[PDB]
Amino acid sequence: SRRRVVITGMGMLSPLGLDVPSSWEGILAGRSGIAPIEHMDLSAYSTRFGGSVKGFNVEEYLSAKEARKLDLFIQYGLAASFQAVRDSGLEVTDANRERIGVSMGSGIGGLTNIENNCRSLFEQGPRRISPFFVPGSIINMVSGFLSIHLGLQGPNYALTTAQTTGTHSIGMAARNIAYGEADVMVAGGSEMAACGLGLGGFGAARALSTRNDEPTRASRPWDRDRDGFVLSDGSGALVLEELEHARARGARIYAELVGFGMSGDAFHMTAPPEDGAGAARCMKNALRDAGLDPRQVDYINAHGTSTPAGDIAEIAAVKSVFGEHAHALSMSSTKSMTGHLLGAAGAVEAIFSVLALRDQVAPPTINLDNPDEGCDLDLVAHEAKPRKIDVALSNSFGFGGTNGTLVFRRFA
Amino acid sequence: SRRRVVITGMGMLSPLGLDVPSSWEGILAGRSGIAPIEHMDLSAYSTRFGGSVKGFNVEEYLSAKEARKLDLFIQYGLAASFQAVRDSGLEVTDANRERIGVSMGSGIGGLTNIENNCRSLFEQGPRRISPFFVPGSIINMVSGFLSIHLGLQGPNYALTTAQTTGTHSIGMAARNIAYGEADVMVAGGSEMAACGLGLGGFGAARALSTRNDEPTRASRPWDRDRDGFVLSDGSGALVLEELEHARARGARIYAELVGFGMSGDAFHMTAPPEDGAGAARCMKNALRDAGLDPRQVDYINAHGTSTPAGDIAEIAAVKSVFGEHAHALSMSSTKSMTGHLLGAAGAVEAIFSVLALRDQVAPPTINLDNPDEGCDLDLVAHEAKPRKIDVALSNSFGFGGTNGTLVFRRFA
Ligand SMILES: CN(C)c1ccc(CNn2cnnc2)cc1
């Protein structure tokens, strides 16, 4: 019968910092991690800025010899995973290694590496493709390499659900534990899609903000002057652990994961429906899964991408799910500061939701100068709002109409 | 407790045929789908052959215009899925669409699209990248496009566990139904990595057979003269259904899915351990999940890739798990005929395991001319073997040390 799941460790790389506390400091201070991209020449691109990880040192975690073989999305996923495991205080032993697994996902995976090897193939032939092209680029290799380095022999897999990946990865990992398939899971996601094909491909869809001359103001969820999402890189990992297993080893418990919802819109390849019907179905699934009255919800970490249709669909969904209580909860988009980490978005935003519970503060939606028509909820405009938070919800919505909702609450 | 899950619909594209019955007819006749790859300059490559899908007509499924937006791996996944749903006879309605979901995965995803868009980018800059590059290349778009086309509102996701994808996709979809999150799931995988990058990438790791003079003899699992796997394309999809749901509408039930195991080797990025310890834990997990004794297993669809180390690890794992019953069961690699469909391997092999149960016959391992040292099990060399099969296992062991096992049982 279904066991309870708590969060005992967290790890992160974001545009705001090389760990959780540094990133959260930036979140509570309203700081933007968005800047013109320095790592390649984007003068021919319509978008030339994004949320880069600044000053990442892979040699805090791995040999440079092993790092050279791995796409940045794998290096980022391993860094966040290592941080989460260390933060948990868990010791991997012969007695528990079969009960500890990993589900770290990505939306796009090793596009930089695949692009670079495509370059080698086209210009020089197949004999110049890296021997490590496959294991250094495919999405399941965060889970694979983490298992090899720490000796995790539990369920080992990866999700890829576009911008929903980090949320689904955490929810499904919690089900593994809830249903007895594992006692511990390291779960989350990682992304580094800031290569020619990434920026070019989202550019070709006219999905990205083109505010090149004021990049810190580009990400403006629910603002009337928003013009698309900001592309961002990084990773989030959580250690999920069965409650009695956590109690039995004296673990520090940050919060309890009480609810997980999924739904499909079945509407459009890329566009969300204006009424947010699939997001509403997903949130209602999560709240019923958590055994909650919707009025218990205090804080929502929105998907809040800064797209015209996505932002307004989320307002419509929250009003539909929460009715008059929609005016009492606080909802913010931390993508206003971090930009959109795609497959890692749900992983870092799950961490932000847990820290909202720990610190009793709703992070701001920065850049919300002029809320759009019908965007009249408490969206925590400009500045962090200290408040009572017993229940926090984190939403993600992605291409294919794929929705995820996580429900966290304080643990006593 | 837990609901029972049965298979009510199957769909496939393989190197043996454009549907299940054509493919299965090839399998039972010991036919090879392996041939030199056409309409592709493989001059500079060490491997020039594989398992292609022959004569696929996407306009049976999609308009030309909608097909132009999608990588071949997505087309293949959608074709298998549509076939599976048609085969099931299921009627999607407003009363049941929230209970029907999708989990179709891929190991490598849209290499062909990435290749062609790299060519645009490198030759003409980013403004010539297709607007549909991202949604037409990402792995979750088989689930996405299927959910949109058929109006499926249930759990919508995609696994990516390299060569284990199809097995994990089916197993996790079965968990959704068993634990009441859905009544129907479409599950499986698809792959089209026969581009320069796939043949080049695996070739750079010298993972592929280089038997260019005799492509149909290349895939020879457990044969002393094997020299690595054969790269193959296609897709498998199953309709998984809660038993009472299937009986209420008078569905034809092929077989019951009674067990699912997962494990991690935590050993090496690409090679399994010599003793197959992780594959043994995974099979034991799957049998425990099914409440079955190893002695009850009749037929194993091996991973059987024709790699020196992988083939021998599976022999060791089966001797360890099955002890005095290890010789009584039959174990065969259908990869001897199909080649290795990577993320779709476990999907087509689950279908072959179900058909082994329907027709009471172990498919052959062709090309098994000289068993290697210690390969003395009943490997069904050369020709199909009619026999009693109540319980059939299907195993997948992929990069990252990720393992999956499915347990199917005859249904009456
Ligand atoms: C591998 N080949 C030969 C290749 C690589 C990059 C470029 C374009 N960017 N570049 C970098 N260094 N010079 C130009 C052109 C050809």
How many whole angstroms separate alpha carbon A248 and alpha carbon A255? Answer: 16
Report which of A29, A12, A28 is spatially closest to residue A20, judged by C-alpha positions: A12
Put simply, the answer to whether B133 touches A168 (Cβ < 8 Å) is: no
List chain B residues with CB under 8 Å of A160.
105, 109, 138-140, 158-160
Question: What secondary structure does DSSP assign to B326-355, as a single string?
Answer: TTTSEEE-THHHH-B-GGGHHHHHHHHHHH
Three-state DSSP class for residue B221: coil
Q: Which two tokens stand for residue A394?
A: 């984190």
B94 burial type by CB count under 10 A (0-12 exposed, 13-18 middle, 19+ buried): exposed
Report which of B42, B106, B38 is spatially closest to residue B71, judged by C-alpha positions: B106
Phi, psi of B253, deg, nearest 5: -100, 120
B54 burial type by CB count under 10 A (0-12 exposed, 13-18 middle, 19+ buried): middle
Question: What secondary structure does DSSP assign to A325-337, as a single string?
Answer: GGGTSEEE-THHH
> Can you give the resolution of this entry in Å?
1.6
B39 burial type by CB count under 10 A (0-12 exposed, 13-18 middle, 19+ buried): exposed
Phi, psi of B272, deg, nearest 5: -80, 160
- C-alpha distance from A104 to closest chain B C-alpha (Å): 11
How long a stretch of residues is chain A? 412
Q: Which two tokens stand for residue B53?
A: 């899908």
How many whole angstroms separate alpha carbon B100 and alpha carbon B89? Answer: 14
Which secondary-structure segment (H or E) carries A23? helix A20-28
List chain A residues with CB under 8 Å of B195.
none
Q: Report whether residue A124 contacts ligand 1, using a CB cutoff of 6 Å.
A: yes
Exposure b/e, B102-111, CB count within 10 A at least 16 = b: bbbbbbbbbb
Greatest pairwise CA separation for chain A in angstroms: 64
Alpha-carbon dihedral angle through residues A17, A22, A27, A29, given to the nearest 10 degrees:
-120
How many whole angstroms separate alpha carbon B328 and alpha carbon B276? Answer: 20
Phi, psi of A395, deg, nearest 5: -110, 150
A156-157 and A100-105 strand pairing:
parallel
Question: Which of B140, B150, B190 is the best mutation test for A, with the most CBs of A within 10 A?
Answer: B140
Contact indicator for A110, A35 with CB cutoff of 8 Å: no
Put simply, the answer to whether A147 touches B401 (Cβ < 8 Å) is: yes
Contact indicator for B301, B278 with CB cutoff of 8 Å: no
Side-chain-facing half-sphere of B307: CA atoms under 13 Å: 23
Contact indicator for B336, B304 with CB cutoff of 8 Å: yes
Amino acid at B302: A
List chain B residues with CB under 8 Å of A162.
138, 140, 144
Integer angstrom CA distances of residue B61 from A386, B85, B144, B343, B388: 54, 12, 15, 22, 38
Phi, psi of A102, deg, nearest 5: -150, 140
Three-state DSSP class for residue B292: coil
Q: What angle do CA B192, B134, A113 make, to 5 degrees?
A: 70
Closest C-alpha residue for ligand 1 atom 2: A123
**Rg of chain A's alpha carbons, rounded to an integer?**
20
Q: Report whether residue A38 contacts ligand 1, using a CB cutoff of 6 Å.
A: no
How many whole angstroms separate alpha carbon A248 and alpha carbon A89? Answer: 13
Contact indicator for A187, A159 with CB cutoff of 8 Å: no
A123 burial type by CB count under 10 A (0-12 exposed, 13-18 middle, 19+ buried): exposed
How many whole angstroms separate alpha carbon B203 and alpha carbon B49? Answer: 12
Three-state DSSP class for residue B105: strand
Instruction: List the alpha helices (DSSP H) in A233-344.
Output: 243-248, 277-289, 308-322, 335-338
The beta-carbon neighbor of B264 closest among A135, A154, A281 is A154
Contact indicator for A270, B135 with CB cutoff of 8 Å: yes
How many whole angstroms separate alpha carbon B224 and alpha carbon A179? Answer: 43
How many whole angstroms separate alpha carbon A110 and alpha carbon A72? Answer: 7
User: What angle do helix axes A345-359 and A20-28 make, rounded to 10 degrees?
Assistant: 70
Put simply, the answer to whether B172 touches A172 (Cβ < 8 Å) is: yes
Q: Which two tokens stand for residue A210?
A: 């083109």
How many whole angstroms separate alpha carbon B217 and alpha carbon B368? Answer: 9
Q: Report whether residue A123 contacts ligand 1, using a CB cutoff of 6 Å.
A: yes
- C-alpha distance from B43 to closest chain A C-alpha (Å): 10
The beta-carbon neighbor of A153 closest among B141, B162, B278 is B278
Three-state DSSP class for residue A161: coil
Report which of B185, B181, B105 is spatially closest to residue B147, judged by C-alpha positions: B185
Report which of B285, B398, B164 is spatially closest to residue A182, judged by C-alpha positions: B285
List chain A residues with CB under 8 Å of B164.
140, 157
Exposure b/e, A32-48, CB count within 10 A at least 16 = b: bbbeebeeeebeebbbb
How many whole angstroms separate alpha carbon A236 and alpha carbon A278? Answer: 25
Q: Which two tokens stand for residue B409?
A: 């049982």
Contacts of B94 (CB under 8 A, 6+ apart): none
Phi, psi of A396, deg, nearest 5: -145, 145
Exposure b/e, B65-84, CB count within 10 A at least 16 = b: ebbebbbbbbbbbbbbbbbb
Closest ligand 1 atom to Cα of A119: 1
Contact indicator for A252, A8 with CB cutoff of 8 Å: yes
Tell me which long-range contacts B87-90 makes (C-beta under 8 A, separation of at least 24): B87/B8, B87/B9, B87/B10, B87/B11, B87/B20, B87/B239, B88/B8, B88/B9, B88/B184, B88/B239, B88/B241, B88/B251, B89/B8, B89/B9, B89/B249, B89/B251, B89/B252, B90/B8, B90/B9, B90/B184, B90/B239, B90/B241, B90/B249, B90/B251
Is the sign of the CA dihedral A211, A214, A218, A224 positive or negative?
negative
Alpha carbon B372 to its chain centroid, in Å, reads: 25
Closest C-alpha residue for ligand 1 atom 7: A119
B365 burial type by CB count under 10 A (0-12 exposed, 13-18 middle, 19+ buried): buried
Contacts of B342 (CB under 8 A, 6+ apart): B107, B108, B162, B163, B165, B191, B193, B231, B232
Q: Report whether residue A128 contacts ligand 1, using a CB cutoff of 6 Å.
A: no
Three-state DSSP class for residue A202: helix
Q: Report whether residue A153 contacts ligand 1, using a CB cutoff of 6 Å.
A: no
B171 burial type by CB count under 10 A (0-12 exposed, 13-18 middle, 19+ buried): buried
How many whole angstroms separate alpha carbon A278 and alpha carbon B154? Answer: 10
Amino acid at A370: N
Give A116 Cα–ligand 1 centroid separation in angstroms: 9
The beta-carbon neighbor of A156 closest among B114, B203, B264 is B264
Report which of A173, A186, A187, A231 is spatially closest to residue A47, judged by C-alpha positions: A231
How many whole angstroms separate alpha carbon B120 and alpha carbon B27? Answer: 40
Question: Which of A62, A104, A157 is the best mutation test for B, with the most CBs of B within 10 A?
Answer: A157
Q: Report whether residue A63 contacts ligand 1, using a CB cutoff of 6 Å.
A: no
How many whole angstroms separate alpha carbon B131 and alpha carbon B116? Answer: 13
